[PDB]
Amino acid sequence: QAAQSVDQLIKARGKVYFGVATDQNRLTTGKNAAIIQADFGQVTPENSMKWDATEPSQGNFNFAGADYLVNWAQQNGKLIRGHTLVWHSQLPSWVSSITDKNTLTNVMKNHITTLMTRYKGKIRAWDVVNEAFNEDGSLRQTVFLNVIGEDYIPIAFQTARAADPNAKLYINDYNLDSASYPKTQAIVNRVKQWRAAGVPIDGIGSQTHLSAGQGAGVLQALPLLASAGTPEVAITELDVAGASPTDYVNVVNACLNVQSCVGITVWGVADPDSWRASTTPLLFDGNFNPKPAYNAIVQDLQ
Template identity: 60%
Template sequence: MKVSAIAAAAPLVAALPAIHERQADASIHDAFVAAGKTYFGVATDQGLLQRESNAAIIQANFGQVTGENSMKWGSLESTQGSYNWGPADFLADWAVENGKEIRGHTLIWHSQLPGWVENIGDAETLREAIRNHVATVMGRYKGKIFHWDVVNEILNEDGTLRDSVFSRLLGEEFVQIAFEAAREADPDAILYINDYNLDQANYGKVNGMVSLVTKWVEAGVPIDGIGTQTHISEGMGANVHGALEQLASAPVNEVAITELDIRNSPVEDYTAVVQACLDVEKCTGITVWGVSDKDSWRQGDNPLLFDGSFAPKDAYNAIIEQLGA
């Protein structure tokens, strides 16, 4: 989706560090697009973009950004009706200024949820809260954010619906409410359901995801895609192909790997995950969950493609070679 510049971009982008020479020999995004996919992206946010080599690496090597925390409900609307747009706007402005696509993450999630939402005790009040939040957030970024994780981590490991304020008061209805509100807010956005531990075919959560999404889509819920986070450990990369194939069997237009990181970043696992996306037609792109190991939420696991000194790892270089770049 082509995006237009945001008026406030110039003063925000001017605050960033100077651009430095590329830290890797080739762009992983460009190579992935040349191989027929849509994007190879990365999670980031304002604080990261304003220090060290994060911005330079993303500018040179990645084609899409996901807000790591800035667009979550607790970050945006901790007090009902009062929004803190600063960090999310910064990310959106920076992405537009630098020609990067944006993934919105996330509208409805049981975690990082404001207390005022968690404490709602009436079903109709919760319905209105969901509709208002989705309409407000997506309305602000309409035409700028091309993918949205509308609901996030809503399943248990056995594939049943997770207990949350949403499921307790509304059952499965909250999924329909959220997706219908999202479609109304931005008819052109691609709407996703996103979850973790969707990394092995015929696992309970994978089975449940395919079954529920099939039921919801057939009932008219406008779900366009399934996101598999893919936070995995060594040796698990080979399982991703089968899981992606199973997820792609649901009646959705696309699937994506949305939060990839792999403990100790083994070459064979990273290349297996990339190959899985290449081989599954519906897989549109991959997002890694951060640039450098030093900033990873998995401290000590060293799971990303750039090390703590912002040097590209063997896994990054192996993917570039794999893609023929």
């Protein structure tokens, strides 16, 4: 852990948290636990709450990994973002082969309700629907869209709201980092339409997996995402190829500039454990020491 906590500092600036993605396999090895305890105030399960992990076989749930994280988080005072309920990746084949609307609808509702009720009152926010958009702004043609139709999104959120009224319900996606981007404009428009129709969408999560130099665009993109009217917006899976302080500070400033931006979650602790380790995109290096970008953020928040 670094001596200064970016979570405490961002809280002093009026935000809710500065967190990281993690899970049992990380918490039990290296210095991950210590770093997370001292420097962050929120955790997102990297994989333990995904469909393949929680319901590998229909109706046969596995919460071992998810329980470890939730209990560890409560004990250590860290907020939790549930991730993720409806998604086309890491989806068991028993789900993807269903072609009946009723069957899939009930399977989806049961998956959502079961996970959310088990952790009712302990989860700050849930990424209810993940990566539902194609790059041109149209809806991704996943099994849920193909079998259930566009209504799958309203249904997912209505169900989540009923399962745990206390949780902030998010629609999450990537490539919403530029204001001119087709996808960015599309999600703002659809979320407005959905909210006008009464769909309980509390927030828009922007994954923010960036390439070097892209940080500047987020300064314009985030205020645009905020214009959709959701109570909150959040940077959910931040990592930047090269981890340049310039990009990292830009993303942080974008959040401080947007009132509704509640916080930031970086996707992992140390570089070698990143899903894109070769681009060393995180805040701590392979030896678990904070990188220049971590210090740049602390100074900026000072």
